[PDB]
Paper text:
[name] adhesin A ([name]) stands out as a pivotal adhesin that plays an indispensable role in the successful establishment of colonization by the pathogen. Originally characterized as a [name], [name] is a 26 kDa lipoprotein found on the bacterial surface and flagellar sheath. For these reasons, [name] is considered a promising vaccine candidate against [name].
The crystal structure of HpaA26–233 was determined using a C-terminally his-tagged protein construct, excluding the first 25 amino acids from the mature lipoprotein. Initial attempt to crystallize the full-length HpaA2-233 was unsuccessful, leading to the engineering of the HpaA26–233 construct resolved at 2.9 Å resolution. Further characterization of the molecule using multi-angle light scattering confirmed that HpaA26-233 exists as a homogeneous and monomeric species in solution, with a calculated molecular mass of 22.5 kDa. The crystal structure reveals that [name] is an elongated protein consisting of two successive antiparallel β-sheets, with an apical extension protruding from a more globular domain composed of one of the β-sheets surrounded by three α-helices (α1-α3-α4) stabilized together by hydrophobic interactions. Of particular interest, the apical loop L5 harbors an intriguing feature in the form of a hydrophobic 118-LLF-120 motif that is fully exposed to the aqueous environment. Consistently, all four 118-LLF-120 motifs observed in the asymmetric unit are engaged in similar crystal contacts with adjacent [name] molecules, burying the leucine and phenylalanine residues within a neighboring cavity formed between the α-helices α1 and α3. According to the cell adhesion assays, the flow cytometric analysis unveils the significant contribution of the 118-LLF-120 apical loop L5 to host-cell recognition, as mutation within this loop resulted in a 55% decrease in binding association with AGS cells.
Residue numbers in the entry: 26 to 238
The structure:
Amino acid sequence: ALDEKILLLRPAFQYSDNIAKEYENKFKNQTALKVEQILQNQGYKVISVDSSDKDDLSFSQKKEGYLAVAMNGEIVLRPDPKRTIQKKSEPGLLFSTGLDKMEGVLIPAGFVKVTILEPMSGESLDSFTMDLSELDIQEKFLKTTHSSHSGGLVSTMVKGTDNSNDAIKSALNKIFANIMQEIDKKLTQKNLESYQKDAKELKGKRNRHHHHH
């Protein structure tokens, strides 16, 4: 079929501080692998590059490579500040829960940009940015601080809990799904092969640019 190589760069993602390192790493790794799957499904051989910066490509890689795909992003999950309810234990209301609870919703923010480049010149052949704020993600969470006028309460009646990490997981799942969906839209053998002319031209301009002076 196609003897053409695509250089897949490592995703460069920054996140908000509330997202665990484990979650960040799994996100990065699965992003890279799913993009790999997409490109292989469209008929290209994929070379995984041990970097995310196009300049750290070896000349070998720039040579064998038809195109390079670069991802970068800021993935933020923060509460919608309007929807944080802080209902506290009313002392003696016939039923007194000695736990103070908070209730909120996490919304997405930031961006993920995918860029198709010509390896030799490093010039951008195309790019699409997905705005994460545009996703309608509202993941409810509740955490329970141990309240102030409950010191006498014994261990059993004050078991705090927090489900933030589950909401973070759910939000990252949807984000990942919607993102891979867009990427699958864009990285079609038809879209990628439509760059072949400019890619040849740019390689040429930069391949001859090395051999003059």
